[PDB]
Chains A and B, each alone.
Chain A
Amino acid sequence: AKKDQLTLRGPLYGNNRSHSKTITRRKWNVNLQPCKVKTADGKTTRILVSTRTLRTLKKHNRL
């Protein structure tokens, strides 16, 4: 699954409304990056996490 693991925010499906307004179905994929994390039992883990939650992790100092 190309959704992240902390939350489950998945792709968003929309239209590729070009000039002259021809419609074409298209997908938006979340930005996934392999940044680490540290749990409160040790067990440092590597999880595919999206960037929006990466910022939240960065400010709550969960690394």
Chain B
Amino acid sequence: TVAKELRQKSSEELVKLVIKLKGELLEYRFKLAHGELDKPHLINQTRRLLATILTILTERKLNWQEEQANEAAVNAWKQHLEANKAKLLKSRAKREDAS
């Protein structure tokens, strides 16, 4: 199951595969932190997967790094800054009225 990875786009598709594996490995470990991970065997495999892929991008002269070359979030942040406007405006008005 390595010669089936040499044949892939050993320059560029492997980078996308690497980032996908890192993401799903992270989500695996997070699932392991709580409960609901019923196949604890997937971690050891997926790490084992990356070990081969990097081994290719290291036999070839390349690197996993530098191959790279908010639905309600923005609304919530806008509300935050608007509240900051209100507080700052209220504070400035009280200071200028006092003088």
Judge A-B direct contact (beta carbons within 8 Å). Answer: no
- Report which A residues bind B (CB closer than 8 A): none
